[PDB]
Amino acid sequence: QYEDGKQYTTLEKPVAGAPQVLEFFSFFCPHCYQFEEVLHISDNVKKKLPEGVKMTKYHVNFMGGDLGKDLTQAWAVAMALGVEDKVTVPLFEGVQKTQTIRSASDIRDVFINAGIKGEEYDAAWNSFVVKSLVAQQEKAAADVQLRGVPAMFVNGKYQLNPQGMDTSNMDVFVQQYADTVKYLSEK
């Protein structure tokens, strides 16, 4: 029942060297909020992935203007410090639920409240390591010529098509999405 054009589509120009499973999102994106905070798509895809398949998750600049670039840099900080699990939920809620994240310092407040020392965050925020992590996120999006989020790519060749899945039941939707990723990851 897996058909190119229903649950997924195939890239016209496949990308070499991409990660096995590459997810793109923005904290500004209401559909990304739905994917992560209500459906837990990434966590459920991870539960169905074959042994030795790595998932990479990158933030994108093209939503939210100045704040969008700030959020990409913050995600790079989160990746550099290994604290993605601590900040994803409060960053999504601060941008979309409470809408208390309007500036770079509000982003920093989320990390401080999650227990990241200000000195650690500030050293990372200003680091060339984080600058290179920002460039990597942008280059990954440039490779697939990303035009929208949320988005998921498998082996630089297939892009998930959530419009072809059942939206009448959220649990069914997550199962179909995760099974499709596993199917594509096996080629």
PDB file of C-alpha atoms in Angstrom:
ATOM      1  CA  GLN A   1       0.000   0.000   0.000  1.00  0.00           C
ATOM      2  CA  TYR A   2       3.183   2.132  -0.003  1.00  0.00           C
ATOM      3  CA  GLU A   3       2.961   4.359  -3.089  1.00  0.00           C
ATOM      4  CA  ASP A   4       5.235   7.192  -4.175  1.00  0.00           C
ATOM      5  CA  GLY A   5       2.917  10.215  -4.033  1.00  0.00           C
ATOM      6  CA  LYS A   6       0.681   9.000  -1.169  1.00  0.00           C
ATOM      7  CA  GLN A   7       2.564   8.513   2.124  1.00  0.00           C
ATOM      8  CA  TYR A   8       5.882   9.843   0.763  1.00  0.00           C
ATOM      9  CA  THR A   9       7.449  11.424  -2.310  1.00  0.00           C
ATOM     10  CA  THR A  10      10.803  10.923  -4.023  1.00  0.00           C
ATOM     11  CA  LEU A  11      13.346  13.704  -4.497  1.00  0.00           C
ATOM     12  CA  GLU A  12      14.040  14.643  -8.112  1.00  0.00           C
ATOM     13  CA  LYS A  13      17.689  15.308  -7.179  1.00  0.00           C
ATOM     14  CA  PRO A  14      18.798  12.982  -4.351  1.00  0.00           C
ATOM     15  CA  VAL A  15      21.267  14.332  -1.801  1.00  0.00           C
ATOM     16  CA  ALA A  16      24.585  12.616  -1.102  1.00  0.00           C
ATOM     17  CA  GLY A  17      25.895  12.305   2.448  1.00  0.00           C
ATOM     18  CA  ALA A  18      22.639  13.275   4.149  1.00  0.00           C
ATOM     19  CA  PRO A  19      21.835  11.646   7.511  1.00  0.00           C
ATOM     20  CA  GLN A  20      19.678   8.527   7.512  1.00  0.00           C
ATOM     21  CA  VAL A  21      16.645  10.271   9.009  1.00  0.00           C
ATOM     22  CA  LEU A  22      16.657  14.068   8.837  1.00  0.00           C
ATOM     23  CA  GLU A  23      13.821  16.017  10.438  1.00  0.00           C
ATOM     24  CA  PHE A  24      13.393  19.771   9.966  1.00  0.00           C
ATOM     25  CA  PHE A  25      11.210  21.888  12.220  1.00  0.00           C
ATOM     26  CA  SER A  26      10.759  25.377  13.580  1.00  0.00           C
ATOM     27  CA  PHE A  27       9.661  26.412  17.040  1.00  0.00           C
ATOM     28  CA  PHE A  28       7.558  29.064  15.240  1.00  0.00           C
ATOM     29  CA  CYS A  29       5.621  26.518  13.197  1.00  0.00           C
ATOM     30  CA  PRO A  30       2.135  25.531  14.486  1.00  0.00           C
ATOM     31  CA  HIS A  31       2.179  22.275  12.574  1.00  0.00           C
ATOM     32  CA  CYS A  32       5.606  21.474  14.102  1.00  0.00           C
ATOM     33  CA  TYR A  33       4.126  22.084  17.555  1.00  0.00           C
ATOM     34  CA  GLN A  34       1.397  19.602  16.689  1.00  0.00           C
ATOM     35  CA  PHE A  35       3.933  17.051  15.411  1.00  0.00           C
ATOM     36  CA  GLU A  36       6.172  17.202  18.468  1.00  0.00           C
ATOM     37  CA  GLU A  37       4.020  18.140  21.446  1.00  0.00           C
ATOM     38  CA  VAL A  38       0.733  16.338  20.608  1.00  0.00           C
ATOM     39  CA  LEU A  39       1.755  13.488  18.271  1.00  0.00           C
ATOM     40  CA  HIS A  40       5.355  12.939  19.509  1.00  0.00           C
ATOM     41  CA  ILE A  41       6.290  12.039  15.939  1.00  0.00           C
ATOM     42  CA  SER A  42      10.069  11.977  16.446  1.00  0.00           C
ATOM     43  CA  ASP A  43       9.856   9.784  19.554  1.00  0.00           C
ATOM     44  CA  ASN A  44       7.515   7.367  17.779  1.00  0.00           C
ATOM     45  CA  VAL A  45       9.614   7.279  14.606  1.00  0.00           C
ATOM     46  CA  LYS A  46      12.611   6.508  16.816  1.00  0.00           C
ATOM     47  CA  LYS A  47      10.728   3.587  18.375  1.00  0.00           C
ATOM     48  CA  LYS A  48      10.250   1.983  14.942  1.00  0.00           C
ATOM     49  CA  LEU A  49      13.677   2.654  13.437  1.00  0.00           C
ATOM     50  CA  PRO A  50      15.933  -0.323  12.640  1.00  0.00           C
ATOM     51  CA  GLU A  51      19.014  -0.889  14.754  1.00  0.00           C
ATOM     52  CA  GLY A  52      21.753   1.554  13.803  1.00  0.00           C
ATOM     53  CA  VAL A  53      19.541   4.171  12.121  1.00  0.00           C
ATOM     54  CA  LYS A  54      20.293   7.650  13.477  1.00  0.00           C
ATOM     55  CA  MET A  55      17.778  10.499  13.581  1.00  0.00           C
ATOM     56  CA  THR A  56      18.969  14.078  13.117  1.00  0.00           C
ATOM     57  CA  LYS A  57      16.709  17.034  13.922  1.00  0.00           C
ATOM     58  CA  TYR A  58      17.514  20.507  12.623  1.00  0.00           C
ATOM     59  CA  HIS A  59      15.849  23.884  13.106  1.00  0.00           C
ATOM     60  CA  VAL A  60      15.185  26.193  10.129  1.00  0.00           C
ATOM     61  CA  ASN A  61      15.509  29.957   9.721  1.00  0.00           C
ATOM     62  CA  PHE A  62      12.734  30.797   7.307  1.00  0.00           C
ATOM     63  CA  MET A  63       9.933  31.232   9.876  1.00  0.00           C
ATOM     64  CA  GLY A  64       9.663  33.923  12.507  1.00  0.00           C
ATOM     65  CA  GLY A  65      12.054  36.506  11.090  1.00  0.00           C
ATOM     66  CA  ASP A  66      14.745  37.638  13.497  1.00  0.00           C
ATOM     67  CA  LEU A  67      13.447  35.321  16.200  1.00  0.00           C
ATOM     68  CA  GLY A  68      13.632  32.407  13.761  1.00  0.00           C
ATOM     69  CA  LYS A  69      17.363  32.909  13.300  1.00  0.00           C
ATOM     70  CA  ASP A  70      17.691  33.236  17.095  1.00  0.00           C
ATOM     71  CA  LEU A  71      15.829  29.941  17.557  1.00  0.00           C
ATOM     72  CA  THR A  72      18.133  28.154  15.078  1.00  0.00           C
ATOM     73  CA  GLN A  73      21.125  29.401  17.032  1.00  0.00           C
ATOM     74  CA  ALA A  74      19.481  28.276  20.276  1.00  0.00           C
ATOM     75  CA  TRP A  75      18.875  24.821  18.849  1.00  0.00           C
ATOM     76  CA  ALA A  76      22.567  24.692  17.940  1.00  0.00           C
ATOM     77  CA  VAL A  77      23.359  25.601  21.571  1.00  0.00           C
ATOM     78  CA  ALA A  78      20.973  22.868  22.700  1.00  0.00           C
ATOM     79  CA  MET A  79      22.778  20.397  20.424  1.00  0.00           C
ATOM     80  CA  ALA A  80      26.243  21.545  21.528  1.00  0.00           C
ATOM     81  CA  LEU A  81      25.345  21.079  25.201  1.00  0.00           C
ATOM     82  CA  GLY A  82      23.303  17.915  24.733  1.00  0.00           C
ATOM     83  CA  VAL A  83      20.174  19.413  26.342  1.00  0.00           C
ATOM     84  CA  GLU A  84      17.610  19.015  23.521  1.00  0.00           C
ATOM     85  CA  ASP A  85      15.430  16.900  25.826  1.00  0.00           C
ATOM     86  CA  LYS A  86      15.271  19.681  28.416  1.00  0.00           C
ATOM     87  CA  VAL A  87      14.425  22.651  26.164  1.00  0.00           C
ATOM     88  CA  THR A  88      12.221  21.352  23.331  1.00  0.00           C
ATOM     89  CA  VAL A  89       8.998  21.428  25.352  1.00  0.00           C
ATOM     90  CA  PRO A  90       9.527  24.868  26.999  1.00  0.00           C
ATOM     91  CA  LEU A  91      10.745  26.396  23.704  1.00  0.00           C
ATOM     92  CA  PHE A  92       7.652  25.170  21.862  1.00  0.00           C
ATOM     93  CA  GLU A  93       5.385  26.396  24.695  1.00  0.00           C
ATOM     94  CA  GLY A  94       7.158  29.734  25.072  1.00  0.00           C
ATOM     95  CA  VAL A  95       6.921  30.521  21.374  1.00  0.00           C
ATOM     96  CA  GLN A  96       3.416  29.108  20.651  1.00  0.00           C
ATOM     97  CA  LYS A  97       1.406  28.585  23.864  1.00  0.00           C
ATOM     98  CA  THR A  98       2.315  31.398  26.269  1.00  0.00           C
ATOM     99  CA  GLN A  99       3.999  33.432  23.488  1.00  0.00           C
ATOM    100  CA  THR A 100       6.419  34.768  26.092  1.00  0.00           C
ATOM    101  CA  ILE A 101       9.428  34.118  23.796  1.00  0.00           C
ATOM    102  CA  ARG A 102       9.745  37.298  21.741  1.00  0.00           C
ATOM    103  CA  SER A 103      13.500  37.921  21.880  1.00  0.00           C
ATOM    104  CA  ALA A 104      16.865  36.218  22.235  1.00  0.00           C
ATOM    105  CA  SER A 105      16.920  36.903  25.970  1.00  0.00           C
ATOM    106  CA  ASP A 106      13.557  35.112  26.379  1.00  0.00           C
ATOM    107  CA  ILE A 107      15.104  32.097  24.656  1.00  0.00           C
ATOM    108  CA  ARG A 108      18.022  32.256  27.097  1.00  0.00           C
ATOM    109  CA  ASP A 109      15.548  32.446  29.996  1.00  0.00           C
ATOM    110  CA  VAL A 110      14.178  29.049  28.941  1.00  0.00           C
ATOM    111  CA  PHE A 111      17.666  27.505  29.134  1.00  0.00           C
ATOM    112  CA  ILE A 112      18.367  29.151  32.522  1.00  0.00           C
ATOM    113  CA  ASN A 113      15.095  27.859  33.940  1.00  0.00           C
ATOM    114  CA  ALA A 114      15.944  24.372  32.662  1.00  0.00           C
ATOM    115  CA  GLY A 115      19.167  24.447  34.656  1.00  0.00           C
ATOM    116  CA  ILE A 116      21.757  25.410  32.037  1.00  0.00           C
ATOM    117  CA  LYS A 117      24.195  27.814  33.669  1.00  0.00           C
ATOM    118  CA  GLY A 118      24.175  31.268  32.101  1.00  0.00           C
ATOM    119  CA  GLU A 119      27.946  31.108  31.628  1.00  0.00           C
ATOM    120  CA  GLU A 120      27.586  27.800  29.764  1.00  0.00           C
ATOM    121  CA  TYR A 121      24.812  29.095  27.523  1.00  0.00           C
ATOM    122  CA  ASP A 122      26.580  32.384  26.784  1.00  0.00           C
ATOM    123  CA  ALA A 123      29.906  30.709  25.997  1.00  0.00           C
ATOM    124  CA  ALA A 124      28.091  28.307  23.668  1.00  0.00           C
ATOM    125  CA  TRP A 125      25.879  30.968  22.072  1.00  0.00           C
ATOM    126  CA  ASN A 126      28.970  32.953  21.093  1.00  0.00           C
ATOM    127  CA  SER A 127      31.080  29.951  20.133  1.00  0.00           C
ATOM    128  CA  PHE A 128      32.409  29.093  16.713  1.00  0.00           C
ATOM    129  CA  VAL A 129      31.291  25.529  17.468  1.00  0.00           C
ATOM    130  CA  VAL A 130      27.704  26.770  17.647  1.00  0.00           C
ATOM    131  CA  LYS A 131      28.256  28.929  14.564  1.00  0.00           C
ATOM    132  CA  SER A 132      29.360  25.815  12.674  1.00  0.00           C
ATOM    133  CA  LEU A 133      26.329  23.873  14.028  1.00  0.00           C
ATOM    134  CA  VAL A 134      24.095  26.678  12.688  1.00  0.00           C
ATOM    135  CA  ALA A 135      25.822  26.427   9.300  1.00  0.00           C
ATOM    136  CA  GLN A 136      25.320  22.641   9.253  1.00  0.00           C
ATOM    137  CA  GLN A 137      21.591  23.009   9.919  1.00  0.00           C
ATOM    138  CA  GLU A 138      21.302  25.569   7.134  1.00  0.00           C
ATOM    139  CA  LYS A 139      23.394  23.496   4.705  1.00  0.00           C
ATOM    140  CA  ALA A 140      21.253  20.424   5.358  1.00  0.00           C
ATOM    141  CA  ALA A 141      18.125  22.422   4.514  1.00  0.00           C
ATOM    142  CA  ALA A 142      19.834  23.922   1.458  1.00  0.00           C
ATOM    143  CA  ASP A 143      20.721  20.452   0.170  1.00  0.00           C
ATOM    144  CA  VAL A 144      17.106  19.302  -0.088  1.00  0.00           C
ATOM    145  CA  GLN A 145      16.054  22.848  -1.086  1.00  0.00           C
ATOM    146  CA  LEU A 146      13.676  22.895   1.869  1.00  0.00           C
ATOM    147  CA  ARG A 147      10.476  24.876   1.308  1.00  0.00           C
ATOM    148  CA  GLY A 148       8.366  23.953   4.327  1.00  0.00           C
ATOM    149  CA  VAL A 149       8.276  22.412   7.778  1.00  0.00           C
ATOM    150  CA  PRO A 150       7.672  20.062   9.460  1.00  0.00           C
ATOM    151  CA  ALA A 151       9.610  17.866   7.077  1.00  0.00           C
ATOM    152  CA  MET A 152      11.321  14.487   7.265  1.00  0.00           C
ATOM    153  CA  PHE A 153      13.757  13.016   4.733  1.00  0.00           C
ATOM    154  CA  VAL A 154      15.009   9.436   4.557  1.00  0.00           C
ATOM    155  CA  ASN A 155      18.451   8.657   3.066  1.00  0.00           C
ATOM    156  CA  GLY A 156      18.516  11.930   1.129  1.00  0.00           C
ATOM    157  CA  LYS A 157      16.014  10.419  -1.288  1.00  0.00           C
ATOM    158  CA  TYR A 158      12.487  10.284   0.159  1.00  0.00           C
ATOM    159  CA  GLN A 159      10.343  12.940   1.814  1.00  0.00           C
ATOM    160  CA  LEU A 160       7.455  11.998   4.087  1.00  0.00           C
ATOM    161  CA  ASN A 161       3.946  12.973   2.899  1.00  0.00           C
ATOM    162  CA  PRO A 162       1.714  13.412   5.981  1.00  0.00           C
ATOM    163  CA  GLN A 163      -1.131  14.630   3.733  1.00  0.00           C
ATOM    164  CA  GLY A 164      -1.532  10.999   2.636  1.00  0.00           C
ATOM    165  CA  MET A 165      -2.162   9.598   6.136  1.00  0.00           C
ATOM    166  CA  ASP A 166      -5.298   9.185   8.278  1.00  0.00           C
ATOM    167  CA  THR A 167      -6.040  12.330  10.317  1.00  0.00           C
ATOM    168  CA  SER A 168      -9.270  11.024  11.884  1.00  0.00           C
ATOM    169  CA  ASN A 169      -7.294   9.230  14.633  1.00  0.00           C
ATOM    170  CA  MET A 170      -4.088  10.749  15.995  1.00  0.00           C
ATOM    171  CA  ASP A 171      -2.687   7.370  17.059  1.00  0.00           C
ATOM    172  CA  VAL A 172      -3.304   5.906  13.609  1.00  0.00           C
ATOM    173  CA  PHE A 173      -1.586   8.920  12.046  1.00  0.00           C
ATOM    174  CA  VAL A 174       1.537   8.473  14.184  1.00  0.00           C
ATOM    175  CA  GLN A 175       1.657   4.740  13.433  1.00  0.00           C
ATOM    176  CA  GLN A 176       1.341   5.285   9.685  1.00  0.00           C
ATOM    177  CA  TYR A 177       3.999   8.002   9.735  1.00  0.00           C
ATOM    178  CA  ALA A 178       6.448   5.926  11.793  1.00  0.00           C
ATOM    179  CA  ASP A 179       5.830   2.793   9.716  1.00  0.00           C
ATOM    180  CA  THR A 180       6.437   4.788   6.534  1.00  0.00           C
ATOM    181  CA  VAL A 181       9.804   6.038   7.842  1.00  0.00           C
ATOM    182  CA  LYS A 182      10.823   2.496   8.775  1.00  0.00           C
ATOM    183  CA  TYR A 183       9.721   1.260   5.348  1.00  0.00           C
ATOM    184  CA  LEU A 184      11.756   3.939   3.562  1.00  0.00           C
ATOM    185  CA  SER A 185      14.791   3.455   5.822  1.00  0.00           C
ATOM    186  CA  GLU A 186      14.941  -0.139   4.591  1.00  0.00           C
ATOM    187  CA  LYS A 187      14.896   1.284   1.006  1.00  0.00           C
TER     188      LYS A 187
END
